[PDB]
Amino acid sequence: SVHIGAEKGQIADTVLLPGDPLRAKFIAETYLENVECYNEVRGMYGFTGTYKGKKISVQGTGMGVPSISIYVNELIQSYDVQNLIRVGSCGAIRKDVKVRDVILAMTSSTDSQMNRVAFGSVDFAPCADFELLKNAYDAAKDKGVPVTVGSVFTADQFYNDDSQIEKLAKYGVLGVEMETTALYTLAAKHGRKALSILTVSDHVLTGEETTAEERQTTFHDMIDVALHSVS
Amino acid sequence: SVHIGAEKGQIADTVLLPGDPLRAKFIAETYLENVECYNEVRGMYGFTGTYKGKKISVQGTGMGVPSISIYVNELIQSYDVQNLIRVGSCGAIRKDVKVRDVILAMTSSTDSQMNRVAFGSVDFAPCADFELLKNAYDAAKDKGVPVTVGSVFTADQFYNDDSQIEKLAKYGVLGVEMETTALYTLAAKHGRKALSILTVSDHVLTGEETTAEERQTTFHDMIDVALHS
Amino acid sequence: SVHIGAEKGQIADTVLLPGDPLRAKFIAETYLENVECYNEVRGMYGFTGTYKGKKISVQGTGMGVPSISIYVNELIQSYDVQNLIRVGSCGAIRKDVKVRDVILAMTSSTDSQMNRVAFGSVDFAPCADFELLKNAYDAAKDKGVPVTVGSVFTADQFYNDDSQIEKLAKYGVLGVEMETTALYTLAAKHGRKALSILTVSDHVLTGEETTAEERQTTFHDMIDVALHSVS
Amino acid sequence: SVHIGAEKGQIADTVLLPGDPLRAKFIAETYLENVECYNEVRGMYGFTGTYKGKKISVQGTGMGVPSISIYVNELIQSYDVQNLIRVGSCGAIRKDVKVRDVILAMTSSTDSQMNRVAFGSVDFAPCADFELLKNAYDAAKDKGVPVTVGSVFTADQFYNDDSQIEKLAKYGVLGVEMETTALYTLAAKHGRKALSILTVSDHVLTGEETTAEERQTTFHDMIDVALHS
Amino acid sequence: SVHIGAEKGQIADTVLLPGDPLRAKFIAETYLENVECYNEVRGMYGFTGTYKGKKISVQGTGMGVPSISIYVNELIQSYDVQNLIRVGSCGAIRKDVKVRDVILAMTSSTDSQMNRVAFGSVDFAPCADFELLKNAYDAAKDKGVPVTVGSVFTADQFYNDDSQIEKLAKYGVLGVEMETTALYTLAAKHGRKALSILTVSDHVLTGEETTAEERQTTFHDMIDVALHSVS
Amino acid sequence: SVHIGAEKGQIADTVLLPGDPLRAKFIAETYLENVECYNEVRGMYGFTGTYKGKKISVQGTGMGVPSISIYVNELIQSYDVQNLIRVGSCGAIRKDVKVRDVILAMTSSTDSQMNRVAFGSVDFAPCADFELLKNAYDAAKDKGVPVTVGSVFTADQFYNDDSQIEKLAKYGVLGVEMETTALYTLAAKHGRKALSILTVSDHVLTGEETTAEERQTTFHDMIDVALHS
């Protein structure tokens, strides 16, 4: 394909999709065996290894709906990827989402226009694949990793002047990131399975920041949950 | 309250919400013990009885977003209802939705302006309360009731000359009905729990019908699942 | 049809369309002779009688644009109904609309999306059928029943957080209910005649409520006017 | 005011509003006595004369919503005009609108953003002042001038590559022109009375023309009706 | 055509398009030789003369997007006009646009719906023809006529209640008039060349008015620049 | 700042903004002397060096409006960057855009909601800083680098099932890419100067490719022009 430099076969059925190519590299080297770099196009790294003798690829997506839209589409159409699990971070916008919680996005809201372009007068609500979602839930509970399930917001603009997250906070929406809507929409469009697992980077509404050691513990929890979600 | 004739204490914490008031009476009379009809205003009946020791209210909502919104707001605001579970039907829009599958809605797309009216340039995806959803999932699996989880479309025009269900089918959307988005949006706004459980009434894009026997079977399943959410 | 349980012929040319099925029953029993219930589907009652030896049906519509849209469509497509007269109540939003006035809606505004779904960049303005409107006007004046003619608003949400009725009040709009737009739009679409006759339930903008005896006198006036509108 | 060169008292309570300033002079000179041209700014002429004892002003508005809006705002705000009656033409979009029918607009649909700019997610249906409308109806019937009442479409692009008049015809809409929604929306905002009276210039969807004799006849009818509203 | 009363040939390749028909007449009589009126339809005058022995027409457009849209379309489709240069005035909305500056509109913003009707979910940005724009720039600098290049706003409503020019002022937008968007969009649509040259009528945001003698000097500068823009 | 690891003073007044960070390193290493990589956060590299006595920073932005917006906001807000010039490629959508033509964007249309989110019912046309544009034009003409000036389309879906480039081609639009509107809108908001210079990567509506030799040639041209804006 155009944005991915793999050959036939270099990419597994199941892909983790972190935002940051350097987290992709870090995840591949830390949790996966017999690792290969199959893509260095644009510095957006893709690696394939094995976890408990199952093939698993890890492809950085970049930030924003357009970036992930390109890689999801090309992972699906050109490499027949079946399961797409995003593993990133979001900004918590409610007091009750706690800094160690691992979030499983059931659906996403958005101020992207990608779906108004498609459906016009329809509000399209992207849906996670429940099968994936459920395995991710049970893998969390099993170990007793704390976990929260609900909706997120897919922002188009990180530094938003007209930010309505204060309203979305009052409808139960959990946090803001910039990718989920695009993942779920394209996955669904193509008959593939998708889920987003998010850790809390900060609390947006009180400025309050997570420490580097909490972030590091929840990240581990996230990747680990993810790794037992398929089947 | 303006559309519900009940006093304090007549309405349960937990309320089932069929569209049809005669299905509400049906549910109340068949499955609940010690039943009182608490509302006859507009012939939109509501009943309260008990099921395994626990008060369960059953309330007709009528058809469409505006209608269910009036009832859900009043149930929430005037009667401090905590759990709101819609039990109804929907037109299957995909072949892999089979006539017997009980659907649980994670979320719902809509052509309703209700949320654009609230949010401007945000698409608000309404969300089911996951605990209720999991409980309903668990209860279906525990009995072996066939169950599919995913999304519906909450339509405003049952008869839609510019229907976009042909495209919504291509994005995974399971079926079409007329209330869910209202219920899920208003429940969350007021910090209450909501879930929609739905049986198939027809296959819309093959026009094809489900028999009265299939519907009776699937409607029972749907009640028995609900009663354990 | 699907939502109406009549046979061929049980429904007249002319239908009154009140919101409340129990007002449908009350109207049928009070003003009409030789009454039959032809529909009990969903508790949404339809009756047919005769008034001064002319056939007239009365079908509850339910509340909101979707509910009425279903019954209007099925009254038109499956029973070839020619005249559709809605007879309900609205909330008065201007001081100069008085509690005894019977309102004849010439057009309606709306925050329903039913017409943006249809026309997109077009603002569609539903229009009453003037012939009906005029007969309704002359039947009012004739008796000296007080009557006001103008536009209404068809709300989607009864308990609206973002309510703009304060602005619509400054453009001359008379009151808010939840059905007119849908009636006029579908009627027009199918080449049928439509009109909405409304009584004032309350004044929305000062909380001020009508008494049960005023409501009862204007309701009579409304139905009576309606009953002499066709031809 | 910025676009009208008149002093206090030169402009009537009642003002006719043709699109074309040469039709304004035509109306003023043919039907009114004791006529003064009160405005020549931008060659958009306005005249005042008398008809049966009563001052009648006649003012060109130009073409389009933006144009008529400037004039109508200024007539209202600077000159306390009470009655504003547009007299013009429109393209018939339906077969049952005949070339001789004088149209009175109850309301108007539009592709103009003017009202969405004011109201967000509301469709504002502009409304005619019913008294003026009834008076014009009565005057047409009293003489036997053929008259049709219903809705028009106020377009922004006379030449519209994405024209939706084919669909608006299916919803009853009688004809297409370019001002009415502006007039009806601004009149009501400021608590004044407005009405549009319109003759047919062509049948747009059969392309077909009306003869110069038909138009002259229908234009006279239209004036004589107006002069009694 | 319908709104223009010329014959074959009466209109030149290049047209000046002022808002005011009486400015069209004034421009024709003051700067052009061997003048003919070729259109008096609607009092919207069109004249053709010669400037330094080149043919040039001057056609009043009227005010607002619809008015100019009609004449541009008919100048293009029925008279094969190649270059369309608008020569009007705008309201300056930033302090740094000065009362003698001649503005060359590179692009326009708008609250007209003409382009949302066409493209829907697309924001269409009309573009000036650079060739014209560049000649107009060089003709200004050459003489040392002071000149500013940027974007304008094409208002639909002169007396706007919900006016957002305070926001457009913060994005660098220079001034407001009511025609440019329509000109550039139709010109572009048909493969023709277009540019808008504007003088400052007032400063909108401080009420501050230009004097009748400044207006008269910049108007001269505008027409003169325009007259050396083609080729 | 959150996405750029630079200290005070490491970033130039003037910053080139290719989409691809490996093209950023390429630009920095080939054309600049005395080069330091000031950022490796997210592997979105930024370099600073000198070109004819003058600091020039080169910064990867990634793909899409959201991505370039983060970088441009931070470059502006945290590093007081004055000149922001995007150097990249775009799919030619018209036949009269030839493979060698260097495009300068006057403006950009978009399907991005970013500006509707800011402005409601206004279409905001983002504008290039004309001085930068003229300077780039002049530098292209001074060398005889083929140059076309006009508009692009800033897309959000590279793969767009409901693509409207077939219509945008008919209105003059030269090519399609994914950043420009963000850059031009954010630069102007904060009173800084911006310009987009773009080479052709393919002809989208004839599907047809440009050879690796053509792209290398046009990419060099594009850099050499930029370096004199």
Ligand SMILES: Nc1nc(F)nc2c1ncn2[C@@H]1O[C@H](CO)[C@@H](O)[C@H]1O
């Ligand atoms: N508070 C936050 N707000 C937004 F809009 N995005 C956040 C936030 N925290 C983390 N992210 C994730 O990190 C990247 C942006 O830095 C994006 O890739 C995004 O997914």
Ligand SMILES: Nc1nc(F)nc2c1ncn2[C@@H]1O[C@H](CO)[C@@H](O)[C@H]1O
């Ligand atoms: N095929 C169907 N399409 C739509 F739009 N709604 C359906 C369908 N089947 C059942 N329903 C549900 O029943 C009521 C409609 O009679 C509505 O309340 C709706 O919820």
Ligand SMILES: Nc1nc(F)nc2c1ncn2[C@@H]1O[C@H](CO)[C@@H](O)[C@H]1O
């Ligand atoms: N103040 C009011 N506001 C709204 F939105 N609707 C009103 C009001 N008063 C009466 N109605 C009519 O009564 C029913 C809703 O109770 C609906 O059927 C509606 O037609």
Ligand SMILES: Nc1nc(F)nc2c1ncn2[C@@H]1O[C@H](CO)[C@@H](O)[C@H]1O
């Ligand atoms: N067929 C027609 N279509 C449209 F859109 N407008 C029409 C038509 N006929 C007459 N008009 C009226 O006359 C002027 C247009 O020349 C406009 O002012 C308009 O009001």
Ligand SMILES: Nc1nc(F)nc2c1ncn2[C@@H]1O[C@H](CO)[C@@H](O)[C@H]1O
């Ligand atoms: N301040 C201003 N605001 C707006 F909206 N338009 C202005 C302004 N100044 C001059 N114009 C130009 O003059 C005419 C309107 O009087 C229109 O033709 C328009 O082009």
Ligand SMILES: Nc1nc(F)nc2c1ncn2[C@@H]1O[C@H](CO)[C@@H](O)[C@H]1O
């Ligand atoms: N044909 C093309 N279509 C679109 F939408 N974008 C294009 C194209 N060619 C190059 N680009 C630019 O390169 C990146 C996409 O790989 C994006 O950053 C984009 O700017």
